[PDB]
Structure formats: structure tokens, C-alpha cells
Amino acid sequence: GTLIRVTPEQPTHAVCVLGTLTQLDICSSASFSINASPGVVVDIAEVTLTMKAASGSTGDQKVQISYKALLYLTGVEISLCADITRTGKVKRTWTWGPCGQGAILLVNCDRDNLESSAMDCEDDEVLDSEDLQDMSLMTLSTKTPKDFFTNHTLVLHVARSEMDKVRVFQATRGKLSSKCSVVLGPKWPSHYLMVPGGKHNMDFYVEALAFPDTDFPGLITLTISLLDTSNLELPEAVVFQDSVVFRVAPWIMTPNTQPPQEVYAFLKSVTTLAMKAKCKLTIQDEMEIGYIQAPHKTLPVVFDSVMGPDFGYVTRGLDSFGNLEVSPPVTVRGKEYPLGRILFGDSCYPSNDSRQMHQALQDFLSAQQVQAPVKLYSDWLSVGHVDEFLSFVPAPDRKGFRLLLASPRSCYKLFQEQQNEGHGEALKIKNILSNKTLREHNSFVERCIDWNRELLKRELGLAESDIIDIPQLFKLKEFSKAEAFFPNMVNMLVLGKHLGIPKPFGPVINGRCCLEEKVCSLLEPLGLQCTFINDFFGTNVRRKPFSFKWWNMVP
Amino acid sequence: GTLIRVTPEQPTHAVCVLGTLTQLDICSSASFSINASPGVVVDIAEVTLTMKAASGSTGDQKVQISYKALLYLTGVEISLCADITRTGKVKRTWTWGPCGQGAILLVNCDRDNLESSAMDCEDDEVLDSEDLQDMSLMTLSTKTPKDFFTNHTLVLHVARSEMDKVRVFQATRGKLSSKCSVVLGPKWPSHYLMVPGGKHNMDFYVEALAFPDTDFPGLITLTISLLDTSNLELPEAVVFQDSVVFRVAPWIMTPNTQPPQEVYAFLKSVTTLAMKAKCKLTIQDEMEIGYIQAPHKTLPVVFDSVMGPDFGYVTRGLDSFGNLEVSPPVTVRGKEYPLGRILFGDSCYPSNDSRQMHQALQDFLSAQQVQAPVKLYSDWLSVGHVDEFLSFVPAPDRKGFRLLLASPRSCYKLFQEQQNEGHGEALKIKNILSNKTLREHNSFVERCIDWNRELLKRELGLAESDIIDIPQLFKLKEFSKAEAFFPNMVNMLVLGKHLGIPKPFGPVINGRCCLEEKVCSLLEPLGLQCTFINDFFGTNVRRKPFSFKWWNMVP
């Protein structure tokens, strides 16, 4: 690495940092011998110098060269840790997978101090020891002669281009808060540190100020420079640098197959389901609840197209969250997606009057590569939402889940079988089967949903046996967009094995609605408990985070 | 893939595109047998249908199901080529390396029509057949029954988010220009095509409108939708899609080891060098001349911190191009860089008064991953430029090149040897060797250049034997920044094996300057011809593009 000058012209001196291999410049000034003092190891391949331990005084060790020349050596220990192996308290670049390395940050997007409405990352202060549990700890470890820093100084810095993405605090009292001051942040990218001589350890707390986005890959690098200050009228020179690389934890969404934790909310049926599912039911608009995870802590985060002690909030934003959903974990042509894929609806090709999810949302979700996006066709609906025809439920067998699609074909087959058995007068079935306009409107919808069937089984790695066809009819409005004919039986509330399904008011045979019996015959064989809720159509459900750690995936 | 409905309720019909495997929905309506007509192949694993050739009439082939049900089939050929194998005229996603696939675009940044000062990609017209040689050709190949398009239509489109990055023209008369109209561009992302029945081939010309940047990864996708138009009062449905993916060719720089082509320009010495090097010498500020390459054409491009028929211009922008240079091809810890690495100077850590190359230039150069960037320390200079201490020249042996550094140590050793032989009065050498202030200024510079020696040999995969130490002294100015003591002998003009070196006016022994003899003894053994130019310090040199194709690299 670093080159050391050796010459007969006069004695020289250099500083070596433990773990760094340096080179000696002997052949530039005068076949020679190297005589190294105890604790100094020199190899020839081209002369490489290394030292076993830090010195207690300036010029503690020396190397003599005989062809004569003399070099003095001072050894120091300078290193920065920052949780590189991903386990916490561990005491090169960032890589992916179970065999990789690199530090992780959380965005400090919760509100631990209840005396203010502001977000914890918006100010320049740590007001409580609880906020430190949301920050990544790194230790600066040093060992030098007691007088070493009279001719040397250490500077900690972050690249100017990312100084508004990270803030670094001084850990006065270590694990405890004591109104910590700022070392780095949006007001300056670098600062000197008054490091004393001897063996010392200083703690820093590092927090992320933003989520990954189009202009932010997610990596933040903190570097420490050792400068030579020995001549007070001469500019300072760099003699050693060391650094650690962090990645900002991405926002991860939970699908319907993750066990539920709590429900925010008709209420008699929701309470009954919350009790059978062993969930916490409490008292806002529709929002998507996800999380961010680091080796030291997991934090819930709300995504808004509201903050609590460990309840995070992120924005980064005309189609609402009924158009944004997530699959269960899948394998696609040999590639694994341990956290599933993110599904959103749009148009099959752009036009002068079509709709799509705003590009800022597509860029935000795509910028966080742990859950790959999928484009589905939804612009054929009056509202344009995926949840109108597509939903997921758990299953105990091979796949672990089922994909549920709306099927006009399943409803027409059910009505024709009732007509064949002499029930055409039930409310009527004969008036629905004879309506040519309704059949033609559903024929358009059948091709639309079947196009999505192909996109879903191609992108999610599914078989036809993994898909259930739930009877559901559609009609076109005065603007030619699809709307439900009767209450939507696919857009259900899922709490583990208990399903809160909107109640249909279709034809009834022997005391039971034909649509409810058909739905039960498709879902109850999987162990799923079906209840039909009167007038089903501000409800949000938080699910358990994945057991899989997102940094072990290889996108 | 696409699902086809089969039922005893009534006969059905579907369209199959050659090369696509479709599925038959038989078990949803009624153990059965499949009777397929000639040219129709059906496999069971789960029933997969495929067809051998396109039909000449609607309902040409049929499949009978006996448990009875009947399905009619029409076969069509619909495909889009676009040079997927990278050879030209070939007739999934984009991948890197010699075993990959995907189409390539050039940015139409030259000026082929000399009647206007505008750039060819700025307007919506192709004014000359020569401009078509700078555009990527793709053929749309179709074969349908003569009456097929009375119930079907084809739409070509580009994703809305990238519609301002690509323009697609109609190839009236094929290889020739005939004032071609626009199919796609910044004014609309999609358009229908009037495709007739029978066997036809339509040509398109696709051009890129921008270079890769922070908000542009370089990929552009063009998709063709087949729509079912059979019911004029019912919305159109998608039944088939196909697409091709293009990458925009990045800007590539040429190092000093590429053979020269022409020189833009004291002139008596430049003409002498241009003649010995067999180069074209002709009659602007300093600019960096590179190129963009695609399988069908190579185009020179000028990068500005001016346009000709095949002479491109790109901007995307306080440190000028003396601070931006390129290494020869290298191997770094087992990773190959066939096109070298891009070197630029900045500060060792940011401060409240330091300098760096503007972030827009770092983002533009980093956005084009074919030549990886390297950060060097140059803020210690009065001007902050890399070219002040670092340059490259060819070499015939092991490495193929040499890395040249300024060395105050080489100049002081040369002067001390002359002093030891009794030449201290030459102009004086004794007055330079006795000047303690000059020695202390150079000691600071020695550590600065040695820091860069470590960065260069670590990032470029070099040995100490690959580096030559050229005698050069420095002094600090009234603002503490480094300036040359005597004319800079590292910042030379390289034309193959002939070097245009600024002339020093240092001590002379036996009719020759000591600095010139030392430089000759270091460079002439490599076959390099050295000439020393009086008053050396608007010159630009264009080099031959690399023989290696950038799309065969794996960044």
C-alpha cells in the first residue's frame, strides 16, 4: 500500500496502521540486507513491511538497510467497525446474500418523543434514549503513543453528494442519551475529532434521513482520514484512510399469507373475526402498512399515497391503494423471491385518455429491489383497482397459498345449473341467463381477466391448479368501464384462516344463497372459515414481518 | 400462455400466433379425447395447443373434444426482430457479455443535413438518406388471412415514462429516405398500424434522443399489441403482445495508447510529429473526443463541460477537461476492464473551502458503466487538474503501457549528482539544493503524489515496475496551492510512439540539458521518440475507437 521513503541522505520516519501492508522505497537511492527490530516483520517478493502491535512511543522500532540507510517506525491501531457481518454488536463495498458483508441503516421515520408532532429525522437532536434503539451503532477503535496526536489529526466525513441522506451523532455516555451533539449532517459533510493518545473506543450513532429513490441507490459511505499536521505553516497531507459502507433498509410490504397482529376499524362481524384469529382490534383512510428491518431492530412503516414511538411514516408520492397489492413468496423460472412480488394495475398500452399509477410511486416501489414489481391490466374497471378481481388466501398444501380471480364463467355455469334443475324463478335467474347485453359485457371482462391470468401465472411462477375461479358478474357503465353486477366476493378481509367476505343477495335454494354455497365449496376444503358480512362496503390490518431477512436475497 | 375457452354450450374460435404455446379450458365444462385436424399439434402433461403454419382463411383448422365440444383455430405470424444477436441484419430483457442478447441504439447527435445548425435528434423529420445510417432498423413481420384485419388491429407503443427518450419513423421505401413520418415520439407514446392481410414486412427506424444519466438506465422497450375489434359497440381487448428491448450506446473515451487519427491545432513541431505519426493535422477550446458504437455503425462524439455529418456533440454538464483522463485497459484483482477506467481529480475529504468536479459530470460519467470511474487527489494543485502530475504512454513489453508520475525526488537526485561531480554553478544547482523552503514545499507534494501512486496502483491493478518517476519540482503559491517550478515534463502530447514534450530550461552539461537527458534515458528504451518543444503552453487529438465491442463487457 502506502510508500515509505528510505535513503542514505538522512534518517527517515513513518507511521504504519495495524492490518495495512506498506512498501519500502530502497532501490531508488544508494543488492542489500534488511535488519528489522523485534515486533517488525519484512518480506521480499518488492519489500513489504508490517508490524505486530501498536507502539507506546514515537520511533519505537527501526529497520536498518546495508548495501547504509535508517528508517524509524511508529505503529498505531486505527479502525472503524459498524456491524459488517449483519448480526449486531460485531465490535470494501456492500454485497447481497447469506455470504456477503456491509452495514445497514434504518430511516428514523418514527416519533419516539411524544412532546412534538415532528418526525425524529427532521431535527438535529436526540431527545430520548429510546430514539437510540432506532439508530445504527459504530465504534471507532484507536491505540497510539500518548504524544502521537500532537503531529496528527483524524477527520470523519461523508461524501458531499449524500450529506443530506445521513446524520451522525456523538455518543456521549455510550448506550445512553445525554443530549448528543452532531458530528456530520445536512449542515456540513466533515468534522475533526479530538482523539487522545493511548487505547480508546468512541461510539457513534448513524441514522438515515431518506428512503431509496430514483436519485438514491441506498448506499452511504463514512470515511476517516488521518492527516499529518507536523508542520504548522505547511498544508496537511493524508497518510491513512479507512471507511465503512452502509445500505438504507428498504420498505417491505406484507401479503395476506403473513399472520395478522392488529386490525384498525359491520364491527360486530370484525370483532368476531378478530377474536377467532386472536388479534388486537382498535379504532383514518386506507394506507399500506409495511416495515423496515435491520439486524438490531424491526420497525413498522405506513406508506401514504400518524406517527408513534415505533410506528413509522413515509410518503414519496389518481389511483388509491386498492390498486396496490403483494403476492406471497414465489419461485419464477428458477429465481426465488423470498418476500414475494408487488402487484399494481395500469393500462395495456398508453393512449390519449388512459389511466396509470403516478410515476413517482412506480419509481419509489422499483427503487427498493427486495420486492420486484409486476404490471397488471386494470384500466378496464370503473375505478382501475387490482383488488376488484384479484386476491390471495392461505392454503395448507403444496403451494402454501391460492390465487383468487373473479370469474363470470363460474357464475353463469352456476345459474345455468339452477335453471336446468327448475329454479329459473329464483331471485331472476331466467332473466339473467336470457340477457344478451349482460353476456356481451361479461365476454369483454372474461378476456380482460384471462389476460391477467396469463400475466400472473407467468410472472409469479404458478400452475392453473393454484388458481380458483370465484363466480362474479360485471356490467359496463355509461363511460364503457366495468362495474360489479352484485357485491364483490373476491375483495375480502383475510385474518389468517378466517375470511370476512362481503355478503351476496343472489338466488336462494333450500335456505342458502347459491353464490355462498359455491364460494364455501371452493374455500372451506382448504381449512378456511368463511363468514358473509352484510353491507361490507377506513379499515387497515398490520401483518407480522417476514421471518426471512431481506439482506440475504440476491436481486 | 393465453387461455382458450372450450365448451359444449356452443362452438368457439381463437387466434394462435406462431411460436406461442396456448392452453385449452376443457375440464371447466362438460375423461376426454382430443381430435386435432392436420397442421395442429396438441400435447397433454394440462392441454397445450400449437400450430405449424399461418392460415389462409378464418377457422381453417379445428379441434374436436369427446367426453361433445368444438373449437375453431386461426393461425397467424406476428413478430418484431430489431437486431437481437448484435451482428446487424438479423431479420425477453437486455443482457451483457459475449453470450447475451438485446438490441442497441445510437443517439442521433450528429448533423447530416448541412442546411441547418440544429442537431438531428432535436426535430421530428429525416431530411436525408444519410441520416438513416445512424438509426437502428427493425422489421415487423406478419402473415394473416386476407380478411383477418377486419376484426383485429395492431398498435405499436413505448412506455409513457420513456417516450421522450426515443423516436420511431415509418420506413417508406425501406433502405431509402422519402421524407419519413413519425410513428412514435415525444408528442405521443402509441399509434395504430394499418397492416393488410397476406405475407408482409414493414421497416421502422428507431433513434435515441438522450444519453444515459441519473434518471435514465439506458433501456428502451417497444411493444406491439394485437387487439380484438370484432364488436364495434364493445371496448377492444388485448389477445397477443410482443416486444423488443434496446439499450442506448454509452459515450466511450479513448486513452493515449489508442492509435491517433487526426490532430486539431509550435505548429512546426506539431506538423513534424503529425508527419512521423502518419496523422491528419488541421485547424476551438479543449474538449474530450470519444465515440458511441453499435453493430451497424461507429460515431465520434465530442463531450463539452461543432457538429458534422458523422461528428457528434453531447453536453450534460469549475474544473475543466485537464482534470478528466482515461487509463489503458486493465485487470483489477481478477476483474477485466477492456476499455480502461476514467480518472478525475478532486479533494481527499470535503470542507468549507475545497474543490471538486461538478456532480452532474460525476453522474453522467458514472451512468455509463462501460468505463468505471476512479477518484484521484488533485485539490493540492493551483488549478486542480490530474494532467499536471499523471500521464500515460505506450510500451512494447509485458503491460503494454507505462504510468508516468511527476517526481520531485527524481529531480533532487539528478541535481545532487551534478553537484557531486562539480557542476553546482550550472543554471543555479547549488542555489536549488540549498533552498530549505523549496525542499519543504516539495516534501508536501511528495506525500500528495505518493497518495495518488497508491490509489492508481490499487484501482488500476499495477506494479511499481509499471510506473516511471519523471523529475519535476513544485512550489506553493500565496494561497498554499502547488504550481510547477519549471515547465511541466509530464503533461505531453502523445501520437503513437512520438512524444511532444514541453522543453525545460534547466542546467546544461556538455551541450545537453540534464532534465532532457534524464527523460530520454527513461522513455527512449521503450521505442518512444522524444522531442522537446519550445513554449509548448485549443489543441485536441482524435484517437482510433477500441477494437473491443462494449456490449461484450460485464460491468
Epitope: 496526536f149 500532537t150 503531529n151 496528527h152 489529526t153 456523538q170 456521549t172 455516555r173 445525554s178 451533539s181 458530528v183 449542515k187 456540513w188 466533515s190 468534522h191 475533526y192 475529532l193 479530538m194 482523539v195 487522545p196 493511548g198 480508546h200 468512541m202 499536521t229 504548522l232 496537511e236 | 470542507s351 468549507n352 473551502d353
Partner: antibody, heavy 121, light 109 residues
């Protein structure tokens, strides 16, 4: 030789503002950290604020956070301290001192003579 | 925000005696301390710039020490010019300093 000369003192009203300055001679302020220290009549030393013009950082004591602002001009070799919303408790002599952090120690070597700021109706 | 207490608040001795002034920090500061002397009407003068080590130009009568979080200044062979108010300064990483209450040394009679 090194010298620090404070100015900008005097008498002000409660709720008002006042700016102090300190001109440096013998060194360039861009290479040193500059501190202000307050001493009320009959009391000890209180640290007020610091600036490091080379890095651009500033720090303040809890007793003045949100009221006091510290700055420096490297072309005039002069440091400044801007006071706002002064109260009777802010009456004291304000000293300007140099911190040569490049020498490895935390102590303040050169101090000025001090300027009295009085807050009273 | 590490707090400190300086004591005794008043000391007395005759010329030629040996006196000590101490201060306790609530938490360790890794030897980041300094000592100052002040006379009425004058700015504070630096004696010690780090634990123990003496500032250039100060008489050899002054020396410092540390034991855990307790820091001490020893003044040997006390001279008439040494009768002044002394302050303990606590420092750390970054330029943020905290001063003690201060102690006065007077003349015994």
C-alpha cells in the same frame, strides 16, 4: 505575535439584539476553532458557542440555543457573535478565545481582553 | 452533557506551602481536561491543555493528574503570584466545553 481584540459591547434593552466582533492578528482564523466564553459579575466561566470556519460547523450551549448565532469572515480575519432576545440573566463579560485543535489539545491558548454586555431597562 | 463539581470552593495557605484543587466528572472524558488561572480584571490564562501536561511558558510549580473521573491540580512552593481564582475545564470530542464552579486561593493569617 498573536492578538485577539473584542468589540461590539455596550448597554441594551431586554428583548433586544446585539452583535459582537473579534479581530484576529498573527494567525489566519480559517485554521483555528473560535470560542466565546461568558462570565457574569461575581460568577465563574460559562461556555457559549464555537465555530470552525474550515469545516463550517457551529455549536451552542443549551442556555442560548435558538437565540445566539455564531459566524466568521475569513477575508476580514474576524469572528462574530449575533445575540437575539436578550434577558437580564445574559449580562456578563464575553471573551473570545482561539482553540488550536491542529496541535492535538483541547485547551484555549490565546484569549482577548473581553467586552461587557449589559441588559437592563 | 457530562456534569462536573470543582472543590474546595475556598483554599488558604502561606507562601511556600503545597495546595491541591480537585474536580469530579459524573462520567469519564478520556483525559480531555484543562486548567486556567484568573486574576481580577484579566482574561483567564491557560496552564494545562490536557490531563497532566503543562502549557509552554508556565512555571514548573504547576502539574496535573487523573484518578478515574477525579482530576487534580497540584501547586508546589506556592508564590505570591499564584494567589488567584482557578477553573477546571472539561472537554470532549467536538468543540463543546463545560466549566466547573471555580475555586479561590487566598492568604492564611
Amino acid at each position: 505575535e498573536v492578538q485577539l481584540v473584542e468589540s461590539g459591547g455596550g448597554l441594551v434593552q431586554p428583548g433586544g439584539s446585539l452583535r459582537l466582533s473579534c479581530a484576529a492578528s498573527g494567525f489566519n482564523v480559517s485554521y483555528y476553532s473560535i470560542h466565546w466564553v461568558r462570565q457574569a459579575p461575581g460568577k465563574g466561566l460559562e461556555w457559549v458557542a464555537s465555530i470552525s470556519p474550515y469545516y463550517g460547523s457551529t455549536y451552542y450551549a443549551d442556555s442560548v440555543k435558538g437565540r445566539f448565532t455564531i459566524s466568521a469572515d475569513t477575508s476580514k480575519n474576524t469572528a462574530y457573535l449575533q445575540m437575539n432576545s436578550l434577558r437580564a440573566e445574559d449580562t456578563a463579560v464575553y471573551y473570545c478565545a482561539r482553540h488550536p485543535y491542529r496541535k492535538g489539545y483541547s485547551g484555549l491558548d490565546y484569549w482577548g481582553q473581553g467586552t461587557l454586555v449589559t441588559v437592563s431597562s | 452533557d457530562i456534569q462536573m463539581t470543582q472543590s474546595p470552593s475556598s483554599l488558604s495557605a502561606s507562601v511556600g506551602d503545597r495546595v491541591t484543587i480537585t474536580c469530579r466528572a459524573s462520567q469519564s472524558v478520556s483525559s480531555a481536561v484543562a486548567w486556567y488561572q484568573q486574576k481580577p480584571g484579566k482574561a483567564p490564562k491557560l496552564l494545562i491543555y490536557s490531563a497532566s501536561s503543562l502549557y509552554s511558558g508556565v512555571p514548573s510549580r504547576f502539574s496535573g493528574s487523573r484518578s478515574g473521573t477525579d482530576f487534580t491540580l497540584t501547586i508546589s512552593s506556592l508564590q505570591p503570584e499564584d494567589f488567584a481564582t482557578y477553573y477546571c475545564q472539561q472537554s470532549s470530542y467536538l468543540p463543546l466545553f463545560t466549566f466547573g464552579q471555580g475555586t479561590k486561593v487566598e492568604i492564611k493569617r
